[PDB]
Amino acid sequence: MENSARQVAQDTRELHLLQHIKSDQSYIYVFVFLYYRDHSVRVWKLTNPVSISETLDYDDLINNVNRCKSAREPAIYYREGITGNDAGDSIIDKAYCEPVSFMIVACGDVDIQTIEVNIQGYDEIEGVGILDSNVTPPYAITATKFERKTSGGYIFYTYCGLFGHGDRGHPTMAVGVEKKNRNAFGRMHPMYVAANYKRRNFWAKKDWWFPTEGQMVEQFIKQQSIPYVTADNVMIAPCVREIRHHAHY
Amino acid sequence: MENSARQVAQDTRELHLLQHIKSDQSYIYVFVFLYYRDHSVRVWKLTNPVSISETLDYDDLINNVNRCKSAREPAIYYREGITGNDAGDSIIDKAYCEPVSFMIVACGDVDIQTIEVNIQGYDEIEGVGILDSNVTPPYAITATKFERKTSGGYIFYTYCGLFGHGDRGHPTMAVGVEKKNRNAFGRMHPMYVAANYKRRNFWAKKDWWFPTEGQMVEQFIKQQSIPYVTADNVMIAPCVREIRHHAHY
Amino acid sequence: MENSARQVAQDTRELHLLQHIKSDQSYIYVFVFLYYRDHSVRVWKLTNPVSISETLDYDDLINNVNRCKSAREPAIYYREGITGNDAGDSIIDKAYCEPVSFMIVACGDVDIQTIEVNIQGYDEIEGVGILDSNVTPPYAITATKFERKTSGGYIFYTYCGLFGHGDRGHPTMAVGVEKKNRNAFGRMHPMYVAANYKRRNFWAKKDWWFPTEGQMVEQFIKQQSIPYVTADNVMIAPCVREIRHHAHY
Ligand SMILES: Nc1nc2c(ncn2[C@@H]2O[C@H](COP(=O)(O)OP(=O)(O)OP(=O)(O)O)[C@@H](O)[C@H]2O)c(=O)[nH]1
Ligand SMILES: Nc1nc2c(ncn2[C@@H]2O[C@H](COP(=O)(O)OP(=O)(O)OP(=O)(O)O)[C@@H](O)[C@H]2O)c(=O)[nH]1
Ligand SMILES: Nc1nc2c(ncn2[C@@H]2O[C@H](COP(=O)(O)OP(=O)(O)OP(=O)(O)O)[C@@H](O)[C@H]2O)c(=O)[nH]1
């Protein structure tokens, strides 16, 4: 009864799930979870068939549901103070709605070795001046700092941190990653490039908000089967156990 | 008097119009018309010299002029309910401002064979989970479902449908299409690629709103000479009659 | 004492600054300064490692701090009138918040010869109709109209103008430029392309607003060392004097 054709259709399904990862027919994903002091979470899905590239601006990274709006000072009173040094006209030093921490989850067939997580202050300008900005500051080379998580045959990567109370407490970030290519024909080789270029905005960055992590895990993480690690360090991810008829090195 | 030089300058003009289509000097366009229950239309022009790629998020697809705003429930009360199953806190089941139907008009020198119209619910996630999402679900392969419309020598394509009252009644969509290339030198060949890459956001998605189709046809469709088909199935498009000094196969 | 190792570490620093321009490790920048009648400035940084491409829509180009909002007419009353000819329902003919003038500053290692500044009215449509629009109208070929400014070994380019009181007084604009490549290996050659494609949105267009030019020069231009030319024609830019041990042609 282990051998039934129905069981093999189930085997097909799960073999399909593991191979679909490496297949050109799947997406790669980076999810950015932002955790606020009110316990709520704002979440951005970045996604593409072959190449994720996105800026999350300040307005993308602050809490836009439990919003900071003293009915007294317009937004520019505060923005000017995080635009230039001592250039503010705000009685508020730090907005409540700025995130406390983040988690980056890279999943699907990412080549984690190509990932970049470049977090900057409000102006997006690395270093002391624009002409001295480096396109890749050392802390943007985050690949080896991700934790590798495994769930059966599934692999994904997590990177967590605090934004803090300095410049990066008013964050902007650029995130990019490539789909792993285990062979030599480039997904942007001249014979392929136009078909992937046509899909450069499949899909544009997309966000949601949730009242707590626990509620998000039930209503979203599990519902969409998004690999995840909770604050108490529990892995929430689908699990496809490896199927193979021969040994693997 | 048929032969006058002035008439030939007119011939030049119309020969220019037909050949400008196939020329690298023209844009390709996809227009997305969204029709609401109040009879108004929101319209997005997607456009590029060689390669259109765009996401129209939920906020792009709902009616943002005749807006849904009960002065009682914040937007997240409703959004949460179309983010996760049964996760809403809204007394409104379906927003008035969600579109009833759509028309996609692909025109200029599109290769309709490369078009993709991928409509999803709010979360933009095809299938049962992100790791099983297909980059091209069967219904995104819409090319053969477009109707081919001809106006003299001009060719364009239309695809209409209803959003309905299920998941896609809270639509997001990814649209991409390539300019037709009737010969072998790719518009993204290494000798060309950088010049077209420089124009990847020429132009970013752009929208308008109009109180009715009839008013839009007068104030916009005709004014900008955008090929179009009205709800009663009348073609509104410029018409350049073919000019040629010899027979065509 | 001219020869001290400390002085040579200073020489290293400034040699680094000049060579970092031509290095792949720097960004190219286009800044768009928009000057309003209230003397305020809205500023967009466009930036990329190798290829800038951006649309600044109408909502990006109008003053969004000193906002136009008669508590009487919704935005569409005015927008409809700049969408189609005589299609408005506004008692206001021209919004206060539309910019008077602009300056484009191209800096870092731009090849100014590849720049395009295509300014259009509200609809973004060049010419008399979409099928006749040219991807490059003559006035978009702006490269030779930029003024070349030098500050020691630093080179940058400025282009100024008025928006006026016609169609382009309701501006949209597409700006693109490539990083100068003084040799033959293309930054989008197949061996390089995927790494730069991954960084196509590093960074997305980013804006600020400032109450006056003078205040912006202190709080932003100088603070970020952004090359600049003030309204009275004073150059504000860092200055690295050329260092070389041999003569230069
Ligand atoms: N290490 C470092 N952090 C900086 C610097 N400038 C600003 N920061 C910010 O400091 C914050 C985190 O640094 P920590 O040393 O952990 O201190 P913190 O918890 O943020 O609180 P502070 O003591 O106010 O900085 C981040 O927001 C950084 O961006 C800097 O020059 N060096
Ligand atoms: N065919 C199909 N449609 C679905 C499914 N899930 C949601 N829908 C939605 O159903 C809507 C259109 O389906 P129809 O069969 O025409 O029904 P409808 O007019 O939308 O009204 P309903 O009966 O409430 O679905 C779209 O919004 C679809 O996205 C599904 O599993 N299959
Ligand atoms: N030259 C020219 N400008 C046009 C045309 N249509 C609209 N304009 C606009 O005219 C404005 C600048 O032209 P100017 O000749 O300097 O006149 P102006 O200062 O704008 O004031 P007006 O006399 O109302 O046009 C810009 O906003 C142009 O876009 C046109 O067909 N030719």
Author numbering:
A (entry chain A), B (entry chain A), C (entry chain A): 1 to 249
According to the publication:
Cypoviruses, members of the family Reoviridae, subfamily Spinareovirus, possess a single capsid layer with turrets and are commonly embedded in crystalline occlusion bodies called polyhedra, which are formed in the cell cytoplasm and mainly composed of a single virus-encoded protein, polyhedrin. To ensure the delivery of virus particles to the target intestinal cells, allowing the transmission of packages of infectious virus between hosts by oral-faecal routes, polyhedra are disrupted only when they are exposed to the very alkaline pH environment found in insect midguts. The fold of all the polyhedrins is highly similar – a β-barrel core sitting on a base domain, surrounded by a common array of five helices (H1–H5). The strongest intermolecular interactions define a trimer composed of a cluster of three β-barrels sandwiched by helices top and bottom.
The full length polyhedrin structures are generally well ordered, as expected for a crystal lattice which has extensive interactions and low solvent content (19–25%), however some types show regions of flexibility: 13 residues (136–148) of CPV5 and 6 residues (68–73) of CPV14 have high (>40 compared with an overall Wilson B-factor of 21.3) B-factors, whilst 13 residues (66–78) of CPV15 could not be modelled. These areas are in structurally variable parts of the proteins. In CPV14, a GTP is located ∼5 Å from the CPV1 position, in a different conformation, binding to the backbone of V2c and embraced by V1 and bulky side chains of an elongated V5. In CPV14 and CPV19 the V2n loops move to occupy some of the central space. In CPV1, 14, 15, 17, 18 and 20 solvent molecules can move between these two voids, whereas in CPV4, 5 and 19 they are blocked by tyrosine residues.
